[PDB]
Point group: C2
């Protein structure tokens, strides 16, 4: 419902897709395009306008009936075909199509990986993408840095110390375990930014997603307290477009509906300039609710004792 208006009115995202598709008419001309999660159909309309021979959109949502009407009203009912259901439940693609040239998708979730459609996109790639075909977009990179956020930490974590006189501190751990999806101001960042994960749809395999172990490293720029780490991702249309097309969900550029992801620290870090925060982040589907993401960090400051903290986004 409102999720579709939010996706469309996300200008940064829809403009990046618009540019990647419409500026590459040469690449789309007379091609067969599969779009995973077409929603109201704007990306399918772009691909058709770019000259695709056939655009197949899959959405599991009941929006499909209205999306077909939109396709008709814009004169593309002979080019764009919409199908309901899960990729995994599709007997065949329509019109006897066996392979496709280009897969468009918007699979990225919050924190890139939370409730994402990555596995669906990889199944569709494995089933239908012709050798050498293109994935729009194909590369996402995750970044992390440290911030000052004493005010929000006091309002959101320490609030539970005293609630109308009552001790609610039993809840504090749970509040700390939940990453926050929200915007951070760039002036709050007190460290360099660390690339810590890349996901390349051209080469990644589903078994690689079972448990992601990765490392990160960033450096303090200030004499300051660090209350939280913040993470975001960048997304690149790399293989396919004539020039690479990119957009960011970070705090130095226009906001997106993904916002940023804030991981509050149990114990604030007292940082000096040039202090080094380095560690590992392990990401995996939660073992009791498969929709939940377990995110475990272990790290040090200048090689001190290891600090560990576990989070679950749910």
């Amino acid at each position: 419902f409102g999720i579709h208006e939010e996706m469309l009115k996300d200008g940064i995202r829809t403009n990046a897709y618009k540019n990647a598709i419409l500026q590459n008419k040469h690449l789309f001309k007379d091609k067969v395009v599969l779009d995973i999660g077409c929603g109201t159909g704007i990306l399918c309309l772009f691909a058709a306008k770019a000259g695709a021979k056939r655009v197949i959109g899959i959405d599991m949502s009941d929006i499909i009936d209205k999306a077909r009407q939109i396709v008709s009203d814009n004169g593309y009912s002979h080019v764009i075909e919409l199908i309901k259901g899960k990729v995994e439940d599709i007997a065949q693609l329509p019109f006897g199509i066996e392979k496709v040239d280009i897969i468009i998708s918007e699979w990225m979730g919050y924190f890139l990986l939370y409730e994402s459609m990555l596995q669906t996109v990889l199944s569709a790639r494995d089933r239908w993408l012709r050798p050498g075909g293109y994935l729009f977009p194909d590369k996402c990179t995750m970044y992390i840095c440290g911030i000052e956020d004493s005010e929000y930490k006091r309002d959101k974590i320490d609030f539970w110390d005293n609630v109308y006189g009552f001790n609610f501190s039993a809840i504090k751990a749970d509040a700390l375990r939940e990453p926050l999806v929200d915007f951070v101001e760039s002036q709050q960042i007190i460290t360099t930014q660390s690339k810590f994960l890349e996901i390349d749809l051209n080469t990644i395999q589903p078994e690689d997603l079972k448990q992601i172990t990765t490392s990160f490293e960033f450096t303090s720029q200030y004499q300051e307290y660090c209350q939280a780490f913040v993470a975001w991702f960048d997304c690149v249309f790399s293989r396919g477009p004539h020039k690479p097309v990119e957009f960011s969900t970070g705090p130095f550029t226009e906001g997106t509906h993904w916002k940023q992801t804030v991981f509050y620290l149990e114990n604030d870090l007292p940082l000096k300039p040039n202090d080094v925060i380095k560690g590992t982040i392990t990401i995996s589907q939660n073992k009791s609710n498969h929709r939940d993401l377990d995110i475990s960090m272990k790290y040090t400051v200048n090689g001190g004792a290891v600090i560990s903290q576990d989070y679950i986004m749910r």
Copy 2:
């Protein structure tokens, strides 16, 4: 998760419950209290602090395990007993209790009735409330008025006329059919306010909720265009407290997490001062998704032709 922090940090709501309970220690002393949907337990703690002999909290949420810890940390483990599950699945109340003196609940949904716990509260009242017992709160009243909102109507409805050159007008009806939960500024109101529904927990019966037909009437105060109706509800602890306790979710007082409910009109009304808008609102559970609320309005301006518009909150 965050829903519990949002409920608690709703100051207007939690203060009204705090006042209704703690200022009526005489009424709670040595009584048996049932609280429906206890969440992290603050209302149960109030009832215990007010002197209840026994407080039974029901919540279907996994929050129960942490809520028990909160009850223990504040010294009330012998008074407050928490039970998981639906009222409808409870064999008996603990400690051999058969009747209770007071039922506390926070059953109100958006637009009062959307995904509310009203039916659960009525079942608990019918099963367990002693004759003459009290419901905290027991009375909610709904109000409606007309507003000017051309800017938000243009940004949210007319946006679909042209989306990157494409005609998305097939979606406009669906956008109009969805009431918006959001805050309205009081300066946007251009009519008097109409009480249009009262729900009295002391006397209402579940069969009355199958379909609510009610009437409304309000008067234009300006020469202005009306783009939407806005509705809210007020909630009163009426029977029981020494003085009635009240709070509002309307736009003339502090915001609450319920916000207000905005019903955009298909065709703007050109109103003159003293024009009368009068009609009926029919509210019923949707026939294909029982969690969805159908809200149908028919009305006139000074007895002109009947205007009808159907909405579904989903």
